[PDB]
Amino acid sequence: SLLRQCPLLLPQNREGTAYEGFVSAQGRDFHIRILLPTDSQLKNARIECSWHLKKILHGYQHILKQRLHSCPDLVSFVVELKTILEIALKA
Numbered sequence: 826s827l828l829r830q831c832p833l834l835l836p837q838n839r840e841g842t843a844y845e846g847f848v849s850a851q852g853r854d855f856h857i858r859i860l861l862p863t864d865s866q867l868k869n870a871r872i873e874c875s876w877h878l879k880k881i882l883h884g885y886q887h888i889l890k891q892r893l894h895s896c897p898d899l900v901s902f903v904v905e906l907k908t909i910l911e912i913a914l915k916a
Contacts, residue, residue, distance in 0.1 A: 827900040834903065843899055849876055850907040851914055857882075857906070867898055888913070 833847030849855010857874025873882020886892035
């Protein structure tokens with residue numbers, strides 16, 4: 826169910842990058858390509874999804890509660906992307 830949880834989740838690399846496509850749920854789209862280069866650990870993966878007029882992204886923990894629910898794998902982390910973006914979409 827992780828391959829269809831977001832209509833903008835394309836496989837970046839054959840090695841299991843899972844960082845390709847608009848993974849931001851907003852008015853029009855959210856071009857946040859987070860490429861996790863770790864073998865199996867979720868933390869330390871490059872999730873600098875440059876968006877909102879910014880090209881170069883930064884590490885995790887950008888928002889006050891951004892890097893909080895990092896217990897699950899990319900599936901739960903990808904599902905929480907919309908819930909995290911909704912906190913700022915209403916401002």
